[PDB]
Amino acid sequence: DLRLHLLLNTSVTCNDGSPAGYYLKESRGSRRWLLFLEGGWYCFNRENCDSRYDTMRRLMSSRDWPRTRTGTGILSSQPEENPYWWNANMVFIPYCSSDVWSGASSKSEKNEYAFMGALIIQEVVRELLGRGLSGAKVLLLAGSSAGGTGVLLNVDRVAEQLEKLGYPAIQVRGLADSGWFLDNKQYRPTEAIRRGIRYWNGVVPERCRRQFQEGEEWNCFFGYKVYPTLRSPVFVVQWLFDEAQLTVDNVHPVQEGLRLYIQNLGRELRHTLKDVPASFAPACLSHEIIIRSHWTDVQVKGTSLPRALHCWDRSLHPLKGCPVHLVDSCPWPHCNPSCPT
Ligand SMILES: C[C@@H](Oc1ccc(-c2ccccc2)cc1)C(=O)O
Ligand SMILES: *[C@@H]1O[C@H](CO)[C@@H](O)[C@H](O)[C@H]1NC(C)=O
Prior knowledge:
29% of the residues lie in helices and 16% in strands.
């Protein structure tokens, strides 16, 4: 069980003005800290956010959050469930800003909602320093879905924050799960993110912002465009046939046009990962994420994700028998026998 702490700076808030927070389970024998960002889409205008507040309120408010949560998958403390980092200090940061972790805008007389995702991450880090993070050797910022995109948008800012505060010995790294999307043609979305960024006052990493310039910062929400600009080490996990990608593409007895569309999607995704040295990309149709209890089961070329992450740790101290770049080459969902069912 991870225990809830509401932020002591109550001006860093969820959408409705309630305090943001984090769930924490300490492991005093360990200098490793895992900070995990939850996902859950986003909202992009007043009417769209009002609908989310009626039926997805936990993603917009802390008023109903439970006192504890159970750590599962990469957040589990059991060696059998988490061969990678079972002994680490574990932090789960709830997603309550509806902004893909990009916002820095407060509620006011002109704003019905606050969009503070980028500030929430920074304040969690600041408050954890006095709970043991000051002694850390590695801080892994991880996340799934919209939280995986959030890792790409925030990992370098966390690294910069810790350097400026006087903690140069903490190695900051990122793990982005299911947050690597293509701005492709539909079979039968970029406008919504463009409007969202304006509504949130959303911020993107500095080098990427300077490449794309004003009006075009939406480009930095796409992993293949923002990843090359990042200085921190980042491991990318992405299904070749991600269900959320196919949903935005309007894909639901497959004839030739759809077969070619799906094969081309997998080939494009593979191509974008060619120069990503730490990656795990199985040829599966799935929405499953790294906090599920059976995350150990899938393998690419005979290597599981917990093993690849361990090999990544070793590389940051090629390795014989310990690979870090694992991308399937086969061209159709479930051509990998270990895909989830
Ligand atoms: C479905 C699932 O994942 C994602 C949803 C949206 C995004 C995303 C990507 C690029 C630009 C803006 C938003 C990424 C992942 C979830 O969050 O429930
Ligand atoms: C609380 O957070 C807000 C927004 O980030 C910031 O302006 C303010 O300085 C913070 N307060 C303290 C005491 O750090």
